[PDB]
Design an enzyme around this catalytic site. Structure first.
Site, PDB file in Angstrom:
ATOM      1  CE  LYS A 165      -3.131  -1.201  -0.688  1.00  0.00           C
ATOM      2  NZ  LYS A 165      -3.384  -1.970  -1.938  1.00  0.00           N
ATOM      3  CG  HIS A 212       4.188  -6.054  -1.156  1.00  0.00           C
ATOM      4  ND1 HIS A 212       4.385  -4.755  -1.569  1.00  0.00           N
ATOM      5  CD2 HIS A 212       2.972  -6.420  -1.622  1.00  0.00           C
ATOM      6  CE1 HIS A 212       3.341  -4.363  -2.277  1.00  0.00           C
ATOM      7  NE2 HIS A 212       2.465  -5.353  -2.317  1.00  0.00           N
ATOM      8  CB  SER A 262      -3.691   2.201   2.030  1.00  0.00           C
ATOM      9  OG  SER A 262      -3.839   1.675   0.717  1.00  0.00           O
TER      10      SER A 262
HETATM   11  N1  PPS Z   1      -1.181   7.106  -9.486  1.00  0.00           N
HETATM   12  C1  PPS Z   1      -1.391   7.128  -8.155  1.00  0.00           C
HETATM   13  N2  PPS Z   1      -1.305   8.290  -7.443  1.00  0.00           N
HETATM   14  C2  PPS Z   1      -1.530   8.326  -6.118  1.00  0.00           C
HETATM   15  N3  PPS Z   1      -1.810   7.222  -5.408  1.00  0.00           N
HETATM   16  C3  PPS Z   1      -1.920   6.009  -6.008  1.00  0.00           C
HETATM   17  C4  PPS Z   1      -1.697   5.882  -7.445  1.00  0.00           C
HETATM   18  N4  PPS Z   1      -1.867   4.598  -7.775  1.00  0.00           N
HETATM   19  C5  PPS Z   1      -2.156   3.934  -6.629  1.00  0.00           C
HETATM   20  N5  PPS Z   1      -2.197   4.791  -5.590  1.00  0.00           N
HETATM   21  C6  PPS Z   1      -2.496   4.480  -4.190  1.00  0.00           C
HETATM   22  O1  PPS Z   1      -1.562   3.545  -3.676  1.00  0.00           O
HETATM   23  C7  PPS Z   1      -2.256   2.650  -2.804  1.00  0.00           C
HETATM   24  C8  PPS Z   1      -2.111   1.254  -3.359  1.00  0.00           C
HETATM   25  O2  PPS Z   1      -0.771   1.054  -2.973  1.00  0.00           O
HETATM   26  P1  PPS Z   1       0.064  -0.094  -3.687  1.00  0.00           P
HETATM   27  O3  PPS Z   1      -0.088   0.207  -5.154  1.00  0.00           O
HETATM   28  O4  PPS Z   1       1.410  -0.178  -3.001  1.00  0.00           O
HETATM   29  O5  PPS Z   1      -0.772  -1.358  -3.215  1.00  0.00           O
HETATM   30  S1  PPS Z   1      -0.069  -2.814  -3.247  1.00  0.00           S
HETATM   31  O6  PPS Z   1       0.740  -3.095  -2.060  1.00  0.00           O
HETATM   32  O7  PPS Z   1       0.678  -2.932  -4.517  1.00  0.00           O
HETATM   33  O8  PPS Z   1      -1.229  -3.748  -3.245  1.00  0.00           O
HETATM   34  C9  PPS Z   1      -3.698   3.102  -2.748  1.00  0.00           C
HETATM   35  O9  PPS Z   1      -3.681   4.092  -1.735  1.00  0.00           O
HETATM   36  P2  PPS Z   1      -5.019   4.454  -0.925  1.00  0.00           P
HETATM   37  O10 PPS Z   1      -5.842   5.186  -1.968  1.00  0.00           O
HETATM   38  O11 PPS Z   1      -4.537   5.361   0.174  1.00  0.00           O
HETATM   39  O12 PPS Z   1      -5.634   3.154  -0.478  1.00  0.00           O
HETATM   40  C10 PPS Z   1      -3.836   3.762  -4.095  1.00  0.00           C
HETATM   41  O13 PPS Z   1      -4.970   4.634  -4.172  1.00  0.00           O
END
Ligand code: PPS
Ligand code: 4NS
Length: 289
Positions: A43, A103, A133
């Site tokens: 996340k 991860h 998240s």
């Molecule tokens: N382009 C972009 N810009 C801003 N934020 C983004 C973007 N893409 C993914 N996210 C946010 O990242 C969170 C998902 O994190 P991960 O991609 O690490 O998830 S995972 O561990 O791969 O499953 C999740 O965060 P939260 O929204 O706080 O839940 C996503 O909304």
């Protein structure tokens, strides 16, 4: 039922039962020198950086980055779920240059990455936003054990009793590791604040110089509002059994500071007190807004 099981300790870290069951496949993973490893605590911005990397690798070509879902374009290495996915096998069959998602805490990373001295992009995100998240992710992503209530989950997270273990140790040990290996250690919050700057950091790290127009293309297509709606990036192509977006969408809010919406003031104070203890002897520094 492959979903909702208890986590299984793998060398001290709670992992999905099926990762643990196939741990030798992961441990023996064969990295390649030009693999780019995107390493994050869950996340923390994995998908965002994976999309960025894939856009970079495709020179900002949106259509090319729609050749498949992000989880196929950038395989989650250790994620092995029988009948569903095998990140190791997907990667084994992927042509270089590979973008590899993990991860794993540093001590669990397959040693081949170290032996191949791969470039690794680590993304850290402030713990409070991560746990929020992760909480919603635990709800929607059914491979996880039931998170419980927010309160219960928050406690599990603080105790490191969550998939992939404690965030604290994860980010700290990865931070420490940047002294041994080529780890571009990025912060989700910096990508929020100045994605262009962060993408330029990625480009520099990758030793790529691209036209401003392509950088701007990459910036545009890696924005949350574009990615959220992008079926190749937003996980909506996931089988609902694995990810129920109606519970919580994968592309949930994509902001920094959502922890304010989730944490009670008491939970926050408790969290901070605990956080300071766990983090003060690390030079690692975050922003929560
Ligand atoms: N382009 C972009 N810009 C801003 N934020 C983004 C973007 N893409 C993914 N996210 C946010 O990242 C969170 C998902 O994190 P991960 O991609 O690490 O998830 S995972 O561990 O791969 O499953 C999740 O965060 P939260 O929204 O706080 O839940 C996503 O909304
Ligand atoms: O490819 N899959 O099937 C897949 C990819 C990611 C994923 O995320 S997880 O945290 O729910 O394992 C789940 C399933």
């Amino acid at each position: 039922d492959v979903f909702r099981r208890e986590l299984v300790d793998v060398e001290g870290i709670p992992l999905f039962w099926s990762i643990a069951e196939h741990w030798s496949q992961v441990e023996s993973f064969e990295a390649r020198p030009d693999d780019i490893l995107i390493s994050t605590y869950p996340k923390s911005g994995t998908t965002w950086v994976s999309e960025i990397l894939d856009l970079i690798y495709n020179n900002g070509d949106a259509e090319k980055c729609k050749r498949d879902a992000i989880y196929k374009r950038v395989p989650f290495m250790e994620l092995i779920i029988p009948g569903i996915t095998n990140g190791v096998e997907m990667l084994n069959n992927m042509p270089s240059p590979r973008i590899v998602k993990t991860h794993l805490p540093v001590q669990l990373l397959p040693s081949s990455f170290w032996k191949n001295d791969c470039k690794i992009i680590y993304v850290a995100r402030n713990a409070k936003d991560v746990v929020v998240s992760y909480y919603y992710f635990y709800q929607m992503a059914k491979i996880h054990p039931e998170p419980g209530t927010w309160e219960e989950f928050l406690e599990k997270f603080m105790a490191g009793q969550v998939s992939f273990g404690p965030w604290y140790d994860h980010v700290k040990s990865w931070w420490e590791k940047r002294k041994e290996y080529r780890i571009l250690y990025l912060f989700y919050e910096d990508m929020k604040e100045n994605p262009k700057c962060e993408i330029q950091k990625i480009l520099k790290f990758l030793e790529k110089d691209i036209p401003e127009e392509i950088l701007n293309k990459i910036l545009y297509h890696s924005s949350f509002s574009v990615m959220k709606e992008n079926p190749s990036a937003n996980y909506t192509t996931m089988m609902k059994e694995e990810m129920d977006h109606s519970v919580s969408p994968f592309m949930r809010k994509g902001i920094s500071g959502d922890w304010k919406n989730q944490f009670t003031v008491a939970q926050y104070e408790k969290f901070e007190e605990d956080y300071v203890k766990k983090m003060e002897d690390s030079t690692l520094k975050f922003r929560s807004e």
